[PDB]
Ligand binder design. Structure first.
Ligand SMILES: CC(C)S[C@@H]1O[C@H](CO)[C@H](O)[C@H](O)[C@H]1O
Length: 335
């Protein structure tokens, strides 16, 4: 009786959702997912720590038993899958960078290990995962060259980023390959992301897209987001995914006032925020091809634990699967 997000935005972009694997065995979760969403991302289940294993000998192997369930579900329900994520400083075991003695691998050995990892994971889902977050959160504006000094940088060096895209494109030449990041509309970081992607495109690196995480709060300036999309879309041939959208009801990551239940005025402010945001996304529909929310409904949000245990209401559906004020405001950005 309520409209379907994916149908409302059919001519604009895929409408996606980040999901933990438990939802596939929950009839009420499956009802809400299959009504509204034509794209899905594994919230954790396709990250390196979720796939990498070592046997009693210390030999690396791959466990796809959980990740496989996403492709099985997507195929059953006619959904596309964003693969998240191949190369990241987070949720990647420190032992992946080391030999049996706990010493750092050589650059040569770690390039080979990255190649095997990306070939194995992207190869397994070739033609079934239409888009990959190949590299996640590689930018640090505090560094002289703008690049985060992670183990990837320390063990391979600054070409690890372009190599990851090379290897992913080898494993699945039809996949759309994304560089994904947060705080992507803050000016200094925006300019580093722009320069990184533009320079990789100019030297023929197979990068097809920029993933804008859009982990927002009610304190964020939506004008800055419009300006960031305007800057990124000047890179010829690049498309944009909104990969991890949510809107915290708080105005910082460390609020001193925490809500038990959200004031109605806060939910209305959130509806106004989401409306202005979707007006900007529709304005840039020529470059945005997927808008994915980082969770199905408010009580599943990472924002209830990542910055400290607290209630937050960051999404379009409440704890009882009901549309929020923001659901209607988002729908009204079209209607
Ligand atoms: C899917 C999310 C966990 S990505 C998220 O972006 C955050 C910024 O708000 C932090 O940078 C976290 O490191 C990162 O995991």
């Amino acid at each position: 009786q309520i409209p379907s997000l994916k149908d409302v935005f059919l001519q604009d972009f895929k409408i996606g959702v980040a999901l933990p694997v438990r939802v596939f065995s929950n009839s009420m979760d499956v009802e809400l997912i299959t009504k509204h969403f034509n794209s899905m991302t594994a919230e954790n289940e396709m990250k390196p720590e979720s796939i990498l294993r070592r046997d009693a000998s210390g030999k690396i192997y791959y466990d796809f038993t959980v990740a496989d369930r996403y492709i099985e579900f997507a195929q059953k329900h006619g959904m596309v899958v964003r693969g998240h994520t191949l190369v990241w400083h987070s949720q990647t075991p420190e032992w992946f960078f080391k030999d049996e003695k706990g010493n750092l691998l050589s650059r040569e050995a770690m390039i080979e290990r990255m190649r095997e990892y990306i070939h194995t994971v992207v190869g397994r889902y070739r033609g079934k995962v239409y888009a990959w977050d190949v590299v996640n959160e590689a930018v640090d504006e505090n560094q002289p060259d703008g690049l985060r000094r992670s183990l990837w940088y320390q063990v391979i060096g600054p070409d690890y980023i372009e190599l990851a895209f090379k290897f992913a494109h080898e494993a699945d030449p039809d996949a759309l390959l994304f560089y994904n990041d947060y705080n992507e509309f803050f000016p200094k970081k925006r300019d580093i992301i722009f320069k990184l992607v533009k320079e990789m495109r100019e030297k023929g690196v197979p990068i097809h897209g920029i993933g804008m995480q859009q982990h927002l709060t009610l304190a964020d300036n939506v004008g800055w987001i419009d300006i960031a999309i305007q800057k990124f879309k000047t890179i010829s041939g690049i498309q944009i995914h909104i990969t991890e959208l949510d809107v915290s009801v708080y105005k910082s990551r460390s609020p001193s006032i925490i809500y038990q239940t959200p004031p109605l005025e806060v939910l209305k402010e959130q509806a106004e925020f989401y409306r202005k945001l979707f007006e900007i996304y529709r304005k840039h529909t020529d470059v945005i091809t997927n808008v994915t929310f980082w969770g199905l409904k408010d009580d599943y949000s990472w924002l209830r634990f990542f910055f400290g245990r607290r209630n937050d209401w960051p999404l379009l559906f409440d704890e009882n699967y009901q549309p929020k004020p923001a659901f209607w405001s988002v729908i009204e950005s079209v209607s």
